[PDB]
Amino acid sequence: TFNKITPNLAEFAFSLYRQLAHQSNSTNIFFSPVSIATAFAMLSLGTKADTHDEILEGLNFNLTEIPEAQIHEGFQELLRTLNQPDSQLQLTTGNGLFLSEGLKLVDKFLEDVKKLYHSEAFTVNFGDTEEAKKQINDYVEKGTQGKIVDLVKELDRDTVFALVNYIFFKGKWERPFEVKDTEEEDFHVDQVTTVKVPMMKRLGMFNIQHSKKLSSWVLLMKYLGNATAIFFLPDEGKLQHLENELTHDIITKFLENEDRRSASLHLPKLSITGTYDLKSVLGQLGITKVFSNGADLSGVTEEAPLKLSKAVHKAVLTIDPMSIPPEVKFNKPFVFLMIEQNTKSPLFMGKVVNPTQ
């Protein structure tokens, strides 16, 4: 069916998406609800009281309704699915915890992080800010075989604790077809901005429909690693309407539909990245205490004060009847979700507005 925590991850995806889209309506959006929520659920194991409750509530878990055991069990099961060989061929995810080597660390936290969340904790010398930044970036670069470079650009001089969360997905259509060369085609960013994109033209039976509720074309395509992308192409002037009207229930209904129709598609071959300061973005969702001097991280270190000084997310996606069917060109801004098929968990959510930006 679906993972217990999938509805929570869906609400977290919409909360974070709508925050980013409200900030700027001219900006690309690309993040992993799954990888950010996993990292902060893992971090919550080392926190207590208001610091702890703020993190899980900020991930859209109602702690009056869902027991904390079912939350961690949900994530462990989700990670079990994501760590299967078929998934691992397309999907790399990692969480690096970097802690000042002068700290006495609680063994229980280091056990739970490594055991339950398959995450890595390192001691680093934050006395040397430039070397610590290099060590963090080397760990991410090595984890992604050179794909993610110089992830952390700045560390505060008083940094004692940094968290880096990364996800790398190699996108390749599951279904083989009559492969042509891409052709360079216009992508209408806005009324006065056009950029060339490589466009794959396909005529076939697609899981595609027009939605009166979303005022959008809705296309579902399958990728290796048990992933389904839902692409929402809004009608002229309806992108904000589409963003406003999306719900988990609506997305579930699209994922359940297997009906196809004949369509001529123009599909841009787009690689996309998103980099986020999680202290900034999660702060706006109400996660603030863990990043403040007040932070209760007594689960990480018993003796000394501790706060999370730095939290960075990076998401990377790379691509490896005889009657006139509809012609649908993804040649203008579109919204998307990528779902993991077993759990129905939102691996990615975002919006392409400028393919070159």
Ligand SMILES: CCC[C@@H](NC(=O)c1cccc2c1CC(=O)N2)[C@@H](O)c1cccc(F)c1C
């Ligand atoms: C509207 C389609 C965008 C999509 N394109 C393709 O998947 C594509 C296009 C041409 C050739 C080709 C592919 C896959 C393959 O194997 N060959 C992709 O760029 C994308 C954008 C944002 C989010 C996201 F999840 C994904 C998958």
